[PDB]
Design a protein around this ligand. Sequence first.
Ligand SMILES: COc1cc2ncc(-c3cccc(N[C@@H]4CCNC4)n3)n2cc1-c1cnn(C)c1
Length: 289
Amino acid sequence: RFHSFSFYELKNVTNNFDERPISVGGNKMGEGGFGVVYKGYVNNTTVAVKKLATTEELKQQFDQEIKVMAKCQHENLVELLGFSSDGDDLCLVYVYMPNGSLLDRLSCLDGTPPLSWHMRCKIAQGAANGINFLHENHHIHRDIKSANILLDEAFTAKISDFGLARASEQTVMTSRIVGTTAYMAPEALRGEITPKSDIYSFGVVLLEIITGLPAVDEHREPQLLLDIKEEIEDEEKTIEDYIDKKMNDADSTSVEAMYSVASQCLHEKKNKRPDIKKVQQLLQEMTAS
Ligand SMILES: COc1cc2ncc(-c3cccc(N[C@@H]4CCNC4)n3)n2cc1-c1cnn(C)c1
């Protein structure tokens, strides 16, 4: 299904996996999902090359990334073009997403203009559509976060980084708890594996979209973004206090509607959260008129 590269090809097209940042003239775009991602050029086409950084666990993440992409073609998932497995380093080659991660566009990293509310609504809907597609195909993502939501030429959202994905038919525990704490559901932090934890993480992403704040900031009060939900419930704050001020087109009704979805996704009790189909429906009604 996918194209098999030899490792040296991907070496050559990434300027020998040039570790310098893009801004300095190198090829490294960033790190995440248990790999480092490089910009490459293959036959006048820009590509992204993820080079995976236990040994059996790394191969398992590689095979898991490939199996999901073979079963899951969707407008809101990144597209795998090929891979390399010869040599000592496993690589995955993807269609290039020129507007980078939702995390960096929300922070306006490198001076990119702030996302409007209208764009943010399409991003939230698209990301929900991508997660829905995963869950319908019986996969748990386990690493949902704004650094793993990329944006193409039209700022369409595409979920990425499926190395931790698990098949999903009772909820089981794992002995190896992995993920980013600021996005993880309480039961995920205790080691449970369940699609209900994906929903919780998506709720944190929705708060990032509304507020333009990162999920964790050690020099901020509160440090954890998900803490604003309890402040709003306890009427110490309003969602208006936290709405990203770098937008001119956010109306109260639809922001409160997206906040309501986020609040439901963030229910402390996993069985009280909506499933992704419900999340998808509420986000569609959000922009209906
Ligand atoms: C302009 O930047 C990018 C363009 C781009 N096109 C495709 C990918 C891609 C595909 C599959 C997986 C994957 N993984 C990364 C690691 C964590 N989640 C994203 N990225 N991609 C990634 C970046 C990027 C990477 N780091 N930063 C800061 C930006």
